[PDB]
Amino acid sequence: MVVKVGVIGTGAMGRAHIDRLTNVLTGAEVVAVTDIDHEAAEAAVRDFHLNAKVYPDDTSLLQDPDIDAVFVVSFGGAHEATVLKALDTDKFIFTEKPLATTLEGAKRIVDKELTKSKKVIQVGFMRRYDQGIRALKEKLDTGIIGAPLVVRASHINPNVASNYSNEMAITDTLIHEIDEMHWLLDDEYTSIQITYPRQSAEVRNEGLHDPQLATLTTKKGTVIQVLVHVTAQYGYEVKLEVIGETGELQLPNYGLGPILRSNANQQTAVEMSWINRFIQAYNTEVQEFIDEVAKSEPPVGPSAWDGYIAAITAAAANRSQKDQETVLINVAGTPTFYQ
Amino acid sequence: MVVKVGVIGTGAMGRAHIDRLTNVLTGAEVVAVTDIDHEAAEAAVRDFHLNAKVYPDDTSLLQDPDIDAVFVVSFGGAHEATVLKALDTDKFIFTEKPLATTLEGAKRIVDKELTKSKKVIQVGFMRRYDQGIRALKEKLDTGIIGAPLVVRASHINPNVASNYSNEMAITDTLIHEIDEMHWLLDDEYTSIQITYPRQSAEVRNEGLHDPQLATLTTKKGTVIQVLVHVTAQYGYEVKLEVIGETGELQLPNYGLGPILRSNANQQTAVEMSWINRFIQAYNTEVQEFIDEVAKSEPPVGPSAWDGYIAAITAAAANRSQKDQETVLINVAGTPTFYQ
Amino acid sequence: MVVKVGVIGTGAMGRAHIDRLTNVLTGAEVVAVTDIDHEAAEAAVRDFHLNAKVYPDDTSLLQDPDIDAVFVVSFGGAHEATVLKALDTDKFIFTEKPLATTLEGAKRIVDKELTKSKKVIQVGFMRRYDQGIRALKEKLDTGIIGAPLVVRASHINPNVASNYSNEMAITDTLIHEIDEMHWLLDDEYTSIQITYPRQSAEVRNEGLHDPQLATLTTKKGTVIQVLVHVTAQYGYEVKLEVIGETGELQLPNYGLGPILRSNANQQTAVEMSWINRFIQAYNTEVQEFIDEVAKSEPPVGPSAWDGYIAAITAAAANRSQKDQETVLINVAGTPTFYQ
Amino acid sequence: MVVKVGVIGTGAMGRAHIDRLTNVLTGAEVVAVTDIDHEAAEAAVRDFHLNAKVYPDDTSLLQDPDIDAVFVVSFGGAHEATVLKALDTDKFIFTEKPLATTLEGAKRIVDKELTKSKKVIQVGFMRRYDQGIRALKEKLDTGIIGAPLVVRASHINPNVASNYSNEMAITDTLIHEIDEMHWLLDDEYTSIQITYPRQSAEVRNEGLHDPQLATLTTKKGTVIQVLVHVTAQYGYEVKLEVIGETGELQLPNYGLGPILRSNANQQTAVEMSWINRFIQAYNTEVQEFIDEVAKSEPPVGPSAWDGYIAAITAAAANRSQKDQETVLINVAGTPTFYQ
Ligand SMILES: NC(=O)C1=CN([C@@H]2O[C@H](COP(=O)(O)OP(=O)(O)OC[C@H]3O[C@@H](n4cnc5c(N)ncnc54)[C@H](O)[C@@H]3O)[C@@H](O)[C@H]2O)C=CC1
Ligand SMILES: NC(=O)C1=CN([C@@H]2O[C@H](COP(=O)(O)OP(=O)(O)OC[C@H]3O[C@@H](n4cnc5c(N)ncnc54)[C@H](O)[C@@H]3O)[C@@H](O)[C@H]2O)C=CC1
Ligand SMILES: NC(=O)C1=CN([C@@H]2O[C@H](COP(=O)(O)OP(=O)(O)OC[C@H]3O[C@@H](n4cnc5c(N)ncnc54)[C@H](O)[C@@H]3O)[C@@H](O)[C@H]2O)C=CC1
Ligand SMILES: NC(=O)C1=CN([C@@H]2O[C@H](COP(=O)(O)OP(=O)(O)OC[C@H]3O[C@@H](n4cnc5c(N)ncnc54)[C@H](O)[C@@H]3O)[C@@H](O)[C@H]2O)C=CC1
Ligand SMILES: O[C@H]1[C@H](O)[C@@H](O)[C@H](O)[C@@H](O)[C@H]1O
């Protein structure tokens, strides 16, 4: 039966999710929208030819009994309150990352969800759905390279908007690696440290350090070195290498485009848009959510607990940014509810 | 509104299309099925949880007024009669390849379709929807390597079933390149020639020559060299290189799986299944057809005319297979109906 | 002993051989040069800091008793007369390919050398010395991919000089593959056919067809498909793929230059000339020649017989060029002198 | 005229250099040897068919006026004393790494040589001569990727002998990166920090931590992250990536061996031997030294100053190994003598 969806926040990613649900994926319909910019919400309805009602706020939308699930796609800082409101209903909840912008907010959500008769929140950490990354994890898990010793990763982005701040290097960019690595390794973090190499001349934003180097450590002692470089110019790229005791695994170059021999070079295109890079993962993640809601079963994707882990680690990273010193992480054990 | 589909032939590929239409793609519903094996048809209904009627044959299914489009997914030899029957209705028609198993059957279909007010047939030549192959064509069409002079291609398959005949090297295997190349090059074929290199010791089928080399010439003068190797053992692989005046284009490695460094080698997995190789293409191809039907517009994918070109070329190749001599091809000018 | 060398022809490759003999290789000194362009000869002496005599012609240089060995590095069509003259002396002879530009010329050389007390000619078929190509042959010979069924090869040049003729597409270019494949496969040819794809707009030489396709068949039934493309623009490249019963072997991309990520592309440099692509092969073959001369022993590298065997096939291809028809080949057995 | 060489220390690398001078390269002759193991010295002369005198010690060898240059290939701890002695002569000096085993020893050599009328010492840091590494440096120096911000490198080795110590991870292994980076970047080091990920189960040596992570900083702010992994099992590999403001540069795939398609995989061999990996670099380095001596000009390769830089940095790294703390490095501005 069709999953009736309400969307809270009809901006860039909200519209992208509306588009997915309407024109790409199967088994859902958007029947309600709201945005603090009412005209934006109206436009979403028009642009996507929805049979949907526009509500003036989240509270009103959440009162609609016909809605089976809500998508929270507002500003990050608005997620916490909205998710908490939604938990007063029986509706399933897909929230874009972050779960909340503070670790305390995340904890509030976890604590509230724990009181319920079903897990209902999935968080939009799409990396876990990317076919390439999953294939690497699968291969790692065969034991073929032994224990993971070091992970080297890159998060490369061409340029940023004028409103992109230093802290967003963590909260908008590194956050993906923050969620991914503990999942990839089936391990828990023990520390994070952010260091600043020489400042790029390409940076146009006051206070923004770029590139940034992030070193994370895990309980088993695996060290993760992430390069974050958001004014890299050349392209958008995600790189991942796992160094094991007996071998290595790395993600192949992304892209299906041809190899060009021309002008004394052999070349392949590099993606310029994060949007295109993770199109598959976004579709897969959302389809999975919808498929679960259709069965009235709890989501199986990243949970509020994953959101909490991410928020704790992001907080630690933002602390590290202040003086470039290592910050310890010690997350509580995973409640059975979230296993 | 949803496109209501009837499926004629509920075998391996018929079920795969049903699965696509039901569980993967958007905007369609299978409401009717038929198969000469009635038990298979019934199973398809149960297996995919369809709300669908099982009909004794194609004729009866075709009388169902609720059906917007039919999928013809029976034995190749059955396609012609069914497509001709379907053309007595107003319904849209997706037929799997081949359009017909004979040249004359293909023309009968074309002649019949030409009598209609709009085009309704799409033929399942999915290569055109493969992202890698499409990306190559697109790059070619930028002019960046100048005019295409030579095409070198491979269709590699690990092993064949006992029913695989010499002529199937053309009709089941090369057929894909036959449809693909004239599209790739915006050109028309003038001849085809099949040669037999030394016979592989891996061949276990009566009368099968393997490998086979196919050489096609085009009106603009491009020479196409295809290696067909169906007992290759190592994997399933589709390779494509275009040699231009000022450069070359080739398909990259297919696969998202990781690069493994282990035991004095660096390695990546090779696909063993054509099914897996073309999952995406099948999805894109069918979604497009459904999207067209939903708008009541003619299909924009490979047409009955393309089916005809394929059939003519395949026939010529089968003739060449008899003595390894060149066989001329002179395809009629495209009717405006198919422009 | 330091081998005293004379060089006949001091153009691009003459200079390159002088360079290697003077600065890289051991046990040789260039003591004499000649070129029909006196200024070119003088430039070679100057540019490579030689204490060398500049002779007005080959005959005078050949009559200098102090010269131990001569290198024939003139225009291909000039090799025959020079080699024949040199055979009137007791000097060792390294000639670049081709041995001659006609079958009759090659035969004249063989007939003359057979009258001598020992073998003195080495032909510059350097492909056999290339580490990559050798490594491929070695792997093939392990049986890991079973019997070789088809070979696909490319011989790519960016452009040609004004003196490059249609006939030279065979005698200067394809001649490498002619020698290479029979060595690689330990097989002999039964036929050759040259075909002319769509003529490139990049051709600037009257009478030159480019690209050209060569199909060679061997006694064991292996079919070799060579692409000759000498106005390719993009670079200089040699490609080799062997299709076996149970697998494939391919030469990797050549180059040590870096991978550049820049401007929405990932790219690596392509060689623009043989001079660098085959520097190792040239070094090895020439050092081997010099080492034999130093011991007053016959060369162990490719012989005038190899040159003649190649010339037979080359002449067959030149015949095929006229009408694009297949030409049969059946070479004589190797004389004892050349075993 | 031929460069007459004396070799001090005729062990593994000593014999390798003798072989280079005797068989591989042009313009030199080994005319004297010495080793504390007088039988090793005798074996060298014998095995390589040398016309050389065996001297009882370095002092006696250095007094031989016919010797143009000496190679110091004894135990590392024995270089300092031997070098300082040779500096009492006018002979050119090629010393293997290290220049000295202490920065104090290195400083003494630097001070002594600085009193001489011209530079005579080259240190055997062969990385700088590796074609790929040089090609990358050169591309970097074009400015095409802007300023270097981060360098990521790997020094991967399959296994170690029973005598390999924790300190050797620096002195024998990382030392190559230690010399290479400041040269690559034309910059000076300001700090080094060694950190230990989880210990590999493959380690069989008391006290050896593997892998190790080395972080170096430069004056311009470039951060260098090196992974040292000496029990990696899979192969020997050197990886290098430079992250620039506007792009990236990395070393390409190393290897000439074929690509094998077999058994559901595509694979290429990985080098297992550091010896084989850097064969070319060793040859080029020594040939350049000989060429300089031949012209009676100072060496142009890595100098005593470079050896001093390496010694300081290695000492700092050995210190950091104790507690994983960052150790500052302050190298004096280069004397013009060494520019
Ligand atoms: N998982 C991923 O890779 C990505 C996640 N996101 C997340 O999606 C969320 C939205 O980002 P964008 O769409 O790019 O930003 P956006 O700025 O384009 O849109 C946000 C929308 O939310 C509306 N809004 C703000 N506060 C609201 C509230 N309290 N209630 C209702 N509506 C409100 C705004 O008016 C705006 O239309 C963010 O949390 C972002 O981090 C965004 C892009 C990629
Ligand atoms: N485009 C592509 O890549 C592919 C195309 N195909 C095409 O799909 C068609 C079906 O192939 P598969 O599903 O693999 O074969 P299959 O043998 O598994 O299924 C064929 C089904 O058709 C039924 N059938 C036969 N004659 C019929 C008729 N007159 N009316 C109704 N049903 C009839 C059979 O009972 C069977 O259930 C073939 O034409 C094949 O060439 C199949 C696979 C891939
Ligand atoms: N093995 C290989 O990969 C290569 C082989 N070659 C061969 O080397 C030879 C020379 O080629 P390039 O140096 O590239 O050509 P080039 O055109 O640069 O030089 C040819 C030189 O020969 C001189 N010459 C012509 N006729 C002469 C004669 N009768 N006596 C003396 N000198 C004469 C010309 O004046 C010119 O200086 C050819 O046989 C060519 O096929 C050339 C390049 C690569
Ligand atoms: N640049 C590179 O990649 C490499 C550098 N090396 C360096 O080469 C040097 C020698 O290494 P190996 O040959 O591997 O060691 P090895 O132990 O095989 O040989 C050293 C030889 O020196 C002799 N010896 C020791 N002290 C001596 C003294 N005071 N005077 C004369 N002879 C003496 C020993 O008896 C022995 O025969 C070391 O400094 C090593 O670090 C070695 C291998 C590679
Ligand atoms: O003489 C050169 C030489 O034979 C090269 O190796 C070949 O690549 C060029 O085509 C030819 O003109």
Short mmCIF file of C-alpha atoms in Angstrom, two decimals, chain B residues 2 7 14-16 73 78 80 87 122 152 184 203 232 269 272 301 312:
data_model
loop_
_atom_site.label_atom_id
_atom_site.label_comp_id
_atom_site.label_asym_id
_atom_site.label_seq_id
_atom_site.Cartn_x
_atom_site.Cartn_y
_atom_site.Cartn_z
CA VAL B 2 -0.70 4.45 -13.59
CA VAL B 7 2.83 -9.30 -19.83
CA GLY B 14 9.19 -11.81 -18.22
CA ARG B 15 9.41 -12.23 -14.50
CA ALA B 16 12.35 -9.87 -14.41
CA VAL B 73 8.62 -11.52 -23.50
CA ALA B 78 6.69 -16.08 -30.98
CA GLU B 80 6.10 -11.67 -34.63
CA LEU B 87 -1.20 -3.93 -33.54
CA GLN B 122 9.69 -0.18 -28.68
CA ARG B 152 36.88 -2.15 -32.17
CA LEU B 184 26.51 4.97 -32.10
CA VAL B 203 33.66 -25.36 -27.11
CA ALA B 232 35.98 -17.21 -22.81
CA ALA B 269 36.66 -8.65 -9.88
CA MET B 272 30.38 -13.22 -14.57
CA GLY B 301 13.59 4.04 -27.79
CA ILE B 312 18.37 -7.70 -41.96
#
